[PDB]
Homo-oligomer: 151 residues x 6
């Protein structure tokens, strides 16, 4: 019964500013299915791998330390088109360019404090999910209202 | 003053997923006036006429079938530019193309389970409202703060 | 498959103050099932019958005229214990004695403007539902998530 | 400073009815600190131990069976008086006796589908937290505005 | 008609934790009328407070009910202190405990210029 | 650090329709800092307005985005005008259109005493 998945994380600013439930609420209200979830303080080296494609960018060392500075909520969300749709729901990388109604549009201001992460593509999602989740931490179950979300 | 009216329906998935109140609340908040409301399981005959323009589309027979599967909330809403504005508030026909902040943007995933209907034009609204409501079932009244909504 | 029902109405102040959706939202969120709904401007004589047991009270003539002064949303809600549970959700007859968290506790101030009505007992509900609803206006359907509300 | 901790679980009906975010959001809003969170379909063995005190109750075997039917959200929350206060926020064991404003008061109907669990005491919390979480899975951190929550 | 009035303040912890709008929304939703509002660091004085005067039938006692008990521990869910805080020294909001207190507190915090006379157009749907 | 500041007013239709708290909650949620607040009938003057000064990086243009277009008809859902109103003459809120406008509007509506200097303790989670 399996459907596309993506990796979503509430960043340390999201946790510190009390937005975990508000963020999850939006993904539930959309009809997406929660397949995995954990709360951790990730190591700086874990984040260096998560953001490996950015290793040469000037903000990278500070981004990885920052993302390891507090707990994060790591999540796997599942549904048709969830990878691209979640990005839409978050807004742009820069909150300044994110529209009201989006998570970043509604809740934050700066690119370095943009509360949330979502995979940018299916292949990125597959890598990120495997990096953060062990296979047994991914739950298979079926939403009773699946009939009303998918024909 | 009598203003423009549109026909809005909460589809069976919208009723089943408990979004009636949320949808009505968005229209009240916007400033529009409720002019008619009933709750029915519509006949397939009625829906075939409702969607008569799409009678040759592949999805037509399934659409009408599905829209008559359960109760819907049928509404008439009144206010300046309410036809085009209600459509903006719902989003695009496909939720995948709808923006966060809109009803479909926030709440659903698939074009076949897109929780709500709105007339696409004034002429469409005139036909639909007459199809769903008897004249005696429409309510004319004046919002006390209508002067804070309209100059 | 039938379960207890009650009659709930959004009074004219509830409609005028934009609380229809907020009220319905609360009954949906609770797990109750919407069985019937209509929007009407009820006659003063209909209300005189609705409130017949109060015919000798000083506020009665003014209460019946008032309740016929604007549109009301008439509803039948269904579920285990719904009659008594809905009253709890509304608060006391007097908003002054209704606790925050209740509909009257949150949204109004005076006994004569207390936004909502609910049947006080099963026998009252049976009478009120029959007075306001024709039998065909009552919808039989089954909430897909009934399994998660009732064991 | 290390403060009191409690074990809180979103039950399978709570997950299925899309109330994860809403529940977490209430605990964040109150000022409590998230100290642990995982998402699992628990073994029936684990639940039999979780509820071991109720092993002779008629509802016990069905309870454990049901709690292992789907994924639950397992949580550790931290703060002054969090054990007794979390229980207040959920309501009474039976939703019928729970007040509007509480989680069960707002969201459910039956004692067997009462969406959430909280430890009934500190000693119960110590056992439950150890049963559901390995030491390495609990997160110690400091809320930046903790000084606006505690003097 | 000028109705009963009470003093309500969002305390510095209320301002710091971003609860100003949430508190105001509750009093507006209830049907009470905002009569006065300012934002000041008074000369507790650990930061800005929102000082307010709300007006309506029985607003003094009702606003206290809406806040919850003095201690959040004794405050019920649905109330402001019940939903949003934990400790007695960090209980986010203040409300006058009587008409006399209210009258004194209003006079202390507000100049008469700062109490605005107006009528909610929906007043006839709130007050008989 | 003193950051950029803009003038925002809840218009009389905004006050009359009970949207003050809702508007404030949006600016608090976004992470902007309330710098000044009053409530007055200015000498449009058809009733009370809530006058505010909000502070943060890019607050002038961002607050305009949060409001939506000048006309609610062109305002998108999610925005204040998009969610809550219909006509251009009843568009509930005002925001300065530039830093220069903001500076002038703030000076016009607020005395320097009424701009409170403070720091959100969560500032380090909003600003790098
Ligand atoms: N110019 C920048 N300055 C500081 N931080 C940045 C910048 N660009 C990106 N970041 C941070 O790095 C994270 C990952 O970057 P990237 O993968 O490019 O964006 P996204 O999160 O949209 O996929 C961003 O979410 C943001 O927190
Ligand atoms: N390609 C499609 N496949 C399935 N159902 C569709 C498709 N396109 C439209 N529908 C359904 O038919 C309904 C009516 O179509 P249409 O009138 O074109 O759109 P709208 O609802 O936006 O007015 C849509 O709301 C949608 O639920
Ligand atoms: N003392 C009173 N003064 C004015 N109106 C009243 C009074 N008591 C009751 N009412 C109005 O009459 C309605 C019906 O009264 P009743 O059936 O006694 O209360 P309830 O609505 O709780 O069943 C109330 O909801 C209220 O609007
Ligand atoms: N009489 C009952 N019938 C069915 N299930 C029950 C009954 N009483 C309790 N339960 C279930 O067992 C759970 C555990 O019981 P208990 O520990 O007594 O209550 P609480 O959950 O409030 O701590 C309850 O939350 C409820 O879901
Ligand atoms: Mg990237
Ligand atoms: Mg169409
Ligand atoms: Mg009665
Ligand atoms: Mg127990």
């Amino acid at each position: 019964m399996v459907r596309e998945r993506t990796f979503i994380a509430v960043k340390p600013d999201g946790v510190q500013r009390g937005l975990i439930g508000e963020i999850i609420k939006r993904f539930e209200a959309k009809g997406f299915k929660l397949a995995g979830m954990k709360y951790i303080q990730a190591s700086e080296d874990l984040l260096k791998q998560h953001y490996i494609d950015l290793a040469d960018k000037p903000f990278y060392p500070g981004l990885c330390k920052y993302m390891s500075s507090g707990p994060v909520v790591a999540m796997c969300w599942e549904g048709t088109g969830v990878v691209k749709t979640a990005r839409v729901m978050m807004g742009e990388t820069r909150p300044a360019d994110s529209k009201p109604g989006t998570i970043r549009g509604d809740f934050c201001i700066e690119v370095g404090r943009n509360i949330i992460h979502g995979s940018d593509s299916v292949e990125s999602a597959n890598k990120e999910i495997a990096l953060w989740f062990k296979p047994e931490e991914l739950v298979s179950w079926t939403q009773t209202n699946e009939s009303w979300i998918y024909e």
